Design a protein around this ligand. Structure first.
Ligand SMILES: O=C(c1cc(OCC2CC2)c2ccccc2c1)N1C[C@@H]2[C@H](C1)[C@H]1CN(C(=O)c3ccc4[nH]nnc4c3)C[C@@H]21
Ligand SMILES: *[C@@H]1O[C@H](CO)[C@@H](O[C@@H]2O[C@H](CO)[C@@H](O)[C@H](O)[C@H]2NC(C)=O)[C@H](O)[C@H]1NC(C)=O
Ligand SMILES: [Ca+2]
Ligand SMILES: [Cl-]
Ligand code: NA
Ligand code: NA
Ligand SMILES: [Zn+2]
Length: 805
């Protein structure tokens, strides 16, 4: 109940929201149907419009107006945004030349530049260039401030997941809003857009910027606006708040626009109907900067023009229906649209088997436009699994398509022409970022970056300490004039051992063999220096990775590669080697196909054995440094050490071999040498973090050799490719993958064909950031370069997406 029999006189758009039975006057009260009886009268005045005219100048203050052009309207803080243009001969902000803001120019009593977040729903990144002629104010923000060509949203590219990610810096699996629609089995509650359950706080995890601000003594305007409140009224309310007394005045504000998302759904991303919404948004920005100019706040506020996601072309006729794939389609609940999430309809159905459902959806139609996944098998770059609200079964939908349950769900719910939600690396889902103010840089373009990074920056601009989030704090310092946060490198926690020759061949009883006994001092001191590290500078280009947890591991040096070998996991954590453009691929000689060699530096007890692989009919093995890439016949025998060996399903060896035999050399010659760091990953609880020894769920049968869930590689080279990867002066270039270690290739529908037709497409799908691998390995890379650490942080968040323009 709400007693609407109170008043809002003086309380219009109050900042401290009251609770029932007191009627509300806050910018959200209509969404609760809770406002006082006179809220519309007193707070949403519409009389005479939103602009001044000449004949209104110097008028007699008539309080019924939506805004005022009376001579006293400034001291009251409530002029129309164009008042000083019409009445005082001044200029619109957009008509003023671009002028560098070298220092904040704030009025007295402003303790810091305020931050205004101007968020636009569905603002596809390409709008910045394609719509530039009809958005003059935004183009001035973009070109004078700091901008990226696009900003990568989080998956799913949906409204609530991305708005809350912006506000928290957290992947949706951590902050809990993993769709616009969710079922939580622990609550037995549902989150929808229709209803009041979404207003309950048990859904919203982490700590958003407004809580973070408040907890640290910075006041925040209330970020959310009920739909009915006109944009003009939101802008003015923000301006009014900026005129409050110093002790009352918030320091961070938000504006939200439903456009161009709303129209982009009806008319598609580039419908002719889309010019006008882009014009209007720009007008809204124009009113804000005009109103800031009237407040002498236009070279003092920091403004973030930011989108939540893009918009793709989608029509009802491009819909895949599960009724054509399954028989008993009523035994499942499907969350539909641009992604699919399947669970059982009834919790008391023992005939429900997710395996038969995944199988009935796998490569069934020749060109089918979605692909089923168990969520732990999703590309680790999406980080979309570690939450009970994410159903076990997931459908990744090709851009431009939908997935539905039965046809009747599409025609009893054509209509729309735009949608979003797809994979967050799709070009159409990319959105915008622009920063403008004294704390941003001037006329500076910065590379694309992920929106999980912004929360740390907004904390910087506001002087706040960020709650723990998934940003990499300092990877965006190159957007800032000042307030850059200077991080130190994490300290190494385990130091390695450097073992020498300590065991004899006969101490090993591993079941391996090698046709190698067909073995000079003119080059025997040569191979001694190799095993002590004489060539480590060629293959460990950016220093060894630091182990950020407590474990026992050895550094092993070889002519062609160095490893960091773990006695706890009986395999390297990392293996590092450089391949120049000149390097030649070689075969595995016929006599060495089944060669595996004891490593006289590592005890038998801390070594894999070959019998375990003979006995496990499902498991085979591979090598981290590839034998194909040896530098000489004599070096090749090092690639066959038991300490270079890792467990691999035969189906994954198809993939892994083609990467080592073909792609590494292809990349060496395209990029003028590459340095490659490879290794295993264990993520059996799909939380994106390195498993501990007691969390392994699978071993090579009859052994303590743990089976990785993934294999990674980090391919580095010189950004200026006219310098070899091993003689690089300047910035670096990187790509990486986290490949799922799976016993089939069902993810790849074309895997019955030659590896040249499918393997690299799979690797592209599972591209990763270096940062992602660090979470999964406890390793810290790039510890010793010539570059600045901030630059190195940006590199580690770099993601290579293989998208066009
Ligand atoms: O008022 C805020 C708001 C603003 C925020 O941050 C704005 C600030 C950053 C600048 C938030 C931040 C974190 C959490 C919630 C937030 C809510 N909304 C009001 C609308 C929108 C955001 C929510 C989703 N929605 C839709 O009607 C809708 C729109 C497009 C769609 N497409 N497909 N389905 C769709 C459904 C109803 C709610
Ligand atoms: C993303 O950031 C969050 C916050 O640091 C991480 O989540 C925390 O993880 C630890 C370990 O599981 C828990 O004790 C905390 O309760 C978690 N907090 C939240 C809010 O989830 C999360 O692990 C990070 N993800 C990645 C991939 O690094
Ligand atoms: Ca884990
Ligand atoms: Cl959704
Ligand atoms: Na075998
Ligand atoms: Na296949
Ligand atoms: Zn939308």
């Amino acid at each position: 109940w709400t007693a609407t029999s109170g008043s809002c006189k003086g309380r219009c758009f109050e900042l401290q929201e009251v609770g029932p039975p007191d009627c509300r006057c806050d910018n959200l009260c209509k969404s609760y149907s809770s406002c006082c009886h006179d809220f519309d009268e007193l707070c949403l005045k519409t009389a005479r419009g939103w602009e001044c005219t000449k004949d209104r100048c110097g008028e007699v203050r008539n309080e019924e107006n939506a805004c005022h052009c009376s001579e006293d309207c400034l001291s009251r803080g409530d002029c129309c945004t164009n008042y000083q243009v019409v009445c005082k001969g001044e200029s619109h902000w957009v008509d003023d030349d671009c002028e560098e803001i070298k220092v904040p120019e704030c009025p007295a009593g402003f303790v810091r530049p305020p931050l205004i977040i101007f968020s636009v729903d569905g603002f596809r990144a390409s709008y910045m260039k394609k719509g530039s002629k009809v958005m003059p104010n935004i183009e001035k923000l973009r070109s004078c401030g700091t901008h990226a060509p696009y900003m990568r949203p989080v998956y799913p590219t949906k409204t609530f997941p991305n708005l809350y990610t912006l506000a928290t810096g957290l992947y949706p699996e951590s902050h809990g809003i993993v769709g616009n629609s969710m079922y939580d089995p622990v609550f037995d509650a549902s989150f929808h857009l229709r209803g009041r359950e979404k207003f309950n706080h048990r859904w919203w995890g982490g700590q958003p910027l407004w809580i973070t601000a408040t907890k640290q003594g910075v006041r925040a305007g209330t970020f959310f606006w009920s739909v009915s409140i006109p944009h003009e009224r939101r802008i003015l309310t923000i301006l009014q708040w900026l005129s409050l007394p110093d002790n009352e005045r918030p320091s961070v504000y938000a504006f939200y626009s439903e456009q161009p998302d709303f129209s982009g759904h009806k008319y598609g991303p580039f419908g002719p109907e889309m010019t006008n919404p882009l014009r209007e948004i720009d007008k809204t920005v124009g009113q804000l900067m005009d109103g800031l100019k009237q407040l002498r706040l236009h070279r003092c506020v920091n403004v973030i023009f930011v989108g939540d996601h893009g918009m793709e072309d989608v029509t009802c006729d491009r819909t895949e229906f599960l009724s054509n794939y399954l028989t008993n389609v009523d035994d499942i609940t499907l969350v539909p649209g641009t992604l699919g999430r399947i669970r059982a309809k009834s919790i008391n159905n023992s005939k429900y088997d997710p395996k038969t459902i995944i199988a009935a959806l796998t490569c069934k139609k020749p060109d089918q436009h979605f692909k089923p996944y168990m969520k732990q098998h999703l590309p680790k770059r999406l980080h979309y699994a570690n939450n009970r609200r994410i159903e076990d079964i997931h459908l990744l939908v090709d851009r431009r398509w939908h997935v539905a349950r039965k046809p009747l769900d599409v025609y009893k719910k054509c209509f729309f022409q735009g949608d979003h939600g797809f994979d967050n690396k799709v070009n159409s889902m990319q959105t915008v970022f622009v920063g403008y103010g004294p704390t941003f840089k001037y006329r500076t373009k910065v590379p694309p970056f992920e929106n999980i990074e912004l929360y740390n920056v907004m904390c910087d601009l506001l002087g706040l300490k960020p709650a723990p989030n998934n940003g990499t704090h300092g990877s965006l310092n190159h957007l800032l004039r000042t307030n850059t946060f200077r991080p130190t490198m994490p300290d190494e926690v385990s130091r390695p051992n450097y073992p020498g020759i300590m065991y004899l061949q006969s101490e090993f009883d591993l079941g391996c063999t090698c046709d190698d006994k067909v073995e000079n001092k003119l080059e025997e001191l040569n191979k001694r220096l190799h095993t002590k590290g004489s060539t480590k500078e060629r293959h460990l280009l950016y220093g060894r990775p630091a182990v950020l947890y407590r474990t026992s591991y050895d550094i092993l040096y070889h002519t062609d590669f160095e490893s960091g070998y773990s006695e706890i996991f009986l395999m390297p954590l990392w293996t590092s080697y450089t391949i120049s453009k000149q390097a030649e691929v070689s075969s595995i000689p016929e006599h060495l196909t089944n060669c595996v060699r004891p490593d006289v530096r590592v005890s038998p007890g801390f070594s894999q054995n070959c019998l375990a692989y003979k006995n496990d009919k499902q498991m085979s093995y591979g090598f981290l440094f590839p034998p194909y890439l040896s530098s000489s016949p004599e070096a090749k025998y090092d690639a066959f050490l038991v300490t270079n060996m890792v467990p691999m399903y035969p189906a994954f060896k198809r993939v892994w071999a083609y990467f080592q035999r073909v792609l590494v050399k292809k990349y060496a010659s395209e990029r003028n040498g590459v340095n490659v760091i490879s290794g295993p990953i264990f993520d059996y609880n799909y939380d994106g973090l390195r498993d501990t020894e007691d969390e392994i769920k699978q071993y090579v049968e009859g052994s303590s050799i743990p089976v990785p869930t993934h294999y990674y590689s980090i391919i580095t080279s010189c950004l200026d490719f006219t310098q070899p990867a091993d003689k690089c002066d300047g910035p670096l270039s990187v790509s990486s993958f986290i490949l799922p270690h799976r016993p089939d290739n069902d993810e790849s529908c074309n895997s019955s064909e030659d590896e040249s037709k499918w393997v690299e497409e799979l690797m592209k799908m599972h591209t990763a950031r270096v940062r992602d691998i660090e979470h999964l390995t406890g390793l810290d890379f790039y510890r010793k370069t010539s570059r600045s650490y901030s630059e190195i942080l940006t590199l580690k968040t770099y993601l290579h997406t293989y998208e066009s323009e």
